[PDB]
Amino acid sequence: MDPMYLLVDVGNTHSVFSITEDGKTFRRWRLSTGVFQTEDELFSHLHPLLGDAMREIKGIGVASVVPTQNTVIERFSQKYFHISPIWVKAKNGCVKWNVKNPSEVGADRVANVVAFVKEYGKNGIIIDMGTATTVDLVVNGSYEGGAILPGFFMMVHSLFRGTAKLPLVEVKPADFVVGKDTEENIRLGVVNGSVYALEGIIGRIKEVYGDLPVVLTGGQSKIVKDMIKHEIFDEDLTIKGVYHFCFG
Amino acid sequence: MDPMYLLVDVGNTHSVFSITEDGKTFRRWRLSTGVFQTEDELFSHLHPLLGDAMREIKGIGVASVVPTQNTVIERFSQKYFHISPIWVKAKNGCVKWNVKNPSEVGADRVANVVAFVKEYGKNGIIIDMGTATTVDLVVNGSYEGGAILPGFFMMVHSLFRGTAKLPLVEVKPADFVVGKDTEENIRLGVVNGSVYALEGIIGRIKEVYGDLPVVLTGGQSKIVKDMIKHEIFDEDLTIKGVYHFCFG
Ligand SMILES: CC(C)(COP(=O)(O)O)[C@@H](O)C(=O)NCCC(=O)O
Ligand SMILES: CC(C)(COP(=O)(O)O)[C@@H](O)C(=O)NCCC(=O)O
Ligand SMILES: [Mg+2]
Ligand SMILES: [Mg+2]
């Protein structure tokens, strides 16, 4: 009566695997996405993590932003569970997609919007801090578009690889107004700076659309949770959206 | 007389070569920095550009943030001009250096501060939009530190290389509150976002140090000059600093 579902969020750096028996409580694991990985390699990684739960999975739902990985997920589902996964995509129904090319919207973003409309309301701004940081706007149940920024690690890594002199700095907020050494300069510019970037984008949105609730999610969100004004902090938002899209 | 000086600003992507006979007006050229270049290669590039001026250079001053390039500049100066270049670095004198390790401050930043204190006064905030975007604070003739952010091109390139689905986008401001396609999303997050990031960092500096004049400079600054509030726009700031540091 409470069948188990596996929800997958394939990101550029990491993939999230979650199981639920009700779509209300979720157990989560995370693995590297890994370029040339196979279906057997995925099973091998998941086996000690899911344990007994493995053989209880009755459906698999996936949001993926890495097309090359999709055949691996497909083969894994078919080989180990004798089912095909259900793929999150922008489509008509519960959300109206008021953008130029809805098919080009990343599946994670689609999942976030679906979860938002299902669980939170018809109006809101979603901030998802991952490999990239995204802003997504929903007004009266219509997706209106958003913004894409490099994520925190992407930023510090870009400064490292892209200059002769700069080191790779740890992602940690600055508790100072000006940096007094190179590492501090980078923390201020990247971490606090990205926070200000987001607050400026959100502010301009709210000028046009009013005081919408802000939800924060993503693998890199906890570090700056207390620096961005938000009404909701929901680390499971994407997985919930995968669940709602695939299994209602 | 009015002897001619060559000023060099060696950056991570490009190097600026400029001549002046008075330290007020500059003729400038830009070349790629280029990893494996030699002194003869540099001379070959500069020959058709400087023309007769090559014969007239009496002094060479350099700010470099690419240490591997420094031997090329040294050899070029010695072979073609029979002189050693003068190297911009942080040292005590007309600027006090109120940071933990002044010797680590990039030579371009040092040059910017020197130029600022010579021409624009004892107090200011310098924004240099280059490969990286820097903020530098000068208070009562003392360098206080700053911030470092990825530059615009660095950001869009990082999104392109760091994800499966994102294209390489042209750097241009967003003219809209949310993006309605991928390109527009990235312009909003990177260009408008970085402007907001800078304004937040600068706003917080001003809360502590007062409303100091802002100077804007750098190879990527023109595209956003009508978007960032500034008292001074001076594309020659770094080269001016090289001149003042080396030749007064
Ligand atoms: C912007 C993203 C890279 C975020 O992905 P992630 O941080 O999850 O790896 C992804 O949503 C994506 O590839 N989007 C396609 C472009 C778009 O949504 O406009
Ligand atoms: C921050 C910089 C990379 C800017 O360089 P550019 O944009 O000129 O290529 C450079 O000033 C630098 O290497 N600085 C050393 C670190 C510091 O100033 O603390
Ligand atoms: Mg392994
Ligand atoms: Mg050549």
Residue span of the structural domain in which B81 resides: 1-122+235-248
- Rama region for B129: left / alpha / beta (φ>0; ψ in -120 to 50; rest): beta
- Is there a catalytic annotation at residue A181? no
Q: Quick check: A60 and A6 in contact, CB under 8 A?
A: yes
The ligand whose atoms approach the alpha carbon of B16 most closely is 2
Q: Which domain CATH number covers B87?
A: 3.30.420.40
Please indicate if the annotation marks A20 as binding a ligand. Answer: no
Q: Tell how far CA A176 is from the center of its chain.
A: 29
Q: What angle do CA A193, A198, A204 make, to 5 degrees?
A: 125
Q: Which two tokens stand for residue B196?
A: 């907001």
Choose the closest CB to B67 out of A65, A164, A201.
Answer: A164
- Sheet containing strand A214-217, edge to edge, reads A96-97, A142-150, A132-139, A124-129, A214-217, A232-233
Contact B189 A162 (CB under 8 A): no
Torsion, Cα of B90, B2, B237, B143 (10° steps): 30
CB-based contact, A49 to chain B, within 8 Å? no
Query: A68 to each of A38, A103, A127, A235, how far by Cα in Å?
Result: 11, 17, 26, 26
Answer yes or no: do B209 and B243 share one domain.
no
Does the beta carbon of A134 lie inside 6 Å of ligand 1?
Answer: yes
The DSSP result for B57-84, as a single string, is EEEEEEEES-GGGHHHHHHHHHHHHSSP
Nearest to A118 by CA among A248, A215, A7: A248
Distance separating alpha carbons of residues B109 and B57, to the nearest angstrom: 25
CA of A132 to the centre of ligand 1 (A): 7
Ligand 1 center to residue B8 CA distance, Å?
40
Method: X-ray
Asked if B180's CB is within 8 angstroms of A197's CB, the reply is: no
Give CA–CA dist A90/B43, Å, rounded.
Answer: 57
Same domain, A19 and A83: yes
Q: Resolution of this entry in Å?
A: 1.6
Q: Check: CB of residue B246 under 8 Å from CB of residue B86.
A: yes
Residues A7 and A104 in one domain: yes
Nearest CA among A197, A157, A156 for reference residue B190: A197
Q: Are A232 and A214 in contact (CB under 8 A)?
A: yes
A112 is known to lie in a ligand binding site: no
DSSP SS3 for B129: strand
Helices (H), B210-234: none
For residue B131, report the distance from its CA to the centre of ligand 2, in Å: 8
Residues A14 and A111 in one domain: yes
Q: How far is CA A9 from the centre of its chain?
A: 7
- Claim to verify: residue A145 and residue A57 sit in the same structural domain: no
**Terminus-to-terminus CA distance in chain A, angstroms?**
15
Residues A72 and A176 in one domain: no
Does B180 reach chain A within 8 Å, measured CB to CB?
yes
Closest C-alpha to B18, from B216, B220, B240: B240
Residue A138: burial class (beta carbons within 10 Å; 0-12, 13-18, 19+):
buried
CA dihedral (B206, B209, B212, B217) positive or negative: negative
* Tokens (6 digits) for B177: 């509150």
Same domain, yes or no, for B114 and B17?
Answer: yes
Residue A21 has, within 13 A of its CA and on its CB side, a CA count of 6
- Amino acid identity, position B112: N
Q: Which amino acid residue places its CA nearest to atom 8 of ligand 1?
A: A11
Q: Give the HSE-up count for residue A67: Cα atoms under 13 Å, Cβ half-sphere.
A: 6
User: How many Å separate Cα B50 from the centre of its chain?
Assistant: 22
Of A148, A133, A138, the C-alpha closest to A113 is A138
Say yes or no for a CB contact (<8 Å) between A166 and B159.
no
Interface contact B199, partner A, CB < 8 A:
yes
Same domain, A70 and A81: yes
Residues A195 and A79 in one domain: no
Residues near A179 by Cβ (< 8 Å), separated by ≥ 6?
Answer: A185, A186, A187, A188, A189, B145, B146, B147, B148
Mutate to test the pocket of ligand 2, among B16, B144, B148, B235 (most ligand atoms within 8 A of CB): B148
User: DSSP per residue over chain A, as a string?
Assistant: ---EEEEEEE-SSEEEEEEESSSSS-EEEEEE--TT--HHHHHHHHHHHHGGGGGGEEEEEEEES-GGGHHHHHHHHHHHHSSPPEEP---SSSSEE-SS-GGGS-HHHHHHHHHHHHHT-S-EEEEEESSEEEEEEEETTEEEEEEEEE-HHHHHHHHHHT-SS----------SSSBSSHHHHHHIIIIIHHHHHHHHHHHHHHHHH-S--EEEESTT-GGGTTTS--SEE-TTHHHHHHHHHHH-
Q: Which residues contact B19 (CB under 8 A, 6 or more apart)?
A: B4, B5, B6, B7, B26, B27, B50, B53, B57
Pocket test for ligand 1, best of A31, A109, A137, A152 (most atoms within 8 A of CB): A109
Q: List the one residue out of B212, B216, B223, B222 whose CA is nearest residue B238.
A: B216
Residues B135 and B114 in one domain: no
Q: In 3-state terms, what secondary structure has residue B98?
A: coil
Question: CB neighbours (10 Å) of residue B125?
Answer: 27
Both B114 and B149 in one domain: the answer is no
Q: What total number of domains does chain B contain?
A: 2
A179–B147 CB contact, under 8 Å: yes
